[PDB]
Amino acid sequence: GTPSADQVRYNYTELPNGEYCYTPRRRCTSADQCCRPYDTTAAFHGCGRIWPKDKREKVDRCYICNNEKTLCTSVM
Structure with a gap:
């Protein structure tokens, strides 16, 4: 029931640029x-x-949160 790191996980997909995807916190x-x-x-x-x-540093980085917007990827 409660939120978990699994909710802020990510899946490897294909991008139009030819690459797959940029890891989180990047x-x-x-x-x-x-x-x-x-x-x-x-x-x-x-x-x-x-x-x-x-x-x-003021630099946009890849982030992923749950639908509940209660949990999100780590800071490090």
Whole structure:
């Protein structure tokens, strides 16, 4: 029932640029690049900063949270 790291997981997919996807907590340019969540029905993708650490450098990074938006990938 409760949220878990499994909810903020990701799945390996193919991108239009020829690559697969950019790992989480990695500097990206477009959300589409950021690896999508393992369960699109229980999570979403996007490029930004969901932590104070990334805010310091001010650099958009791949992130993945659950549908409940209660749990998200680690900061490190």
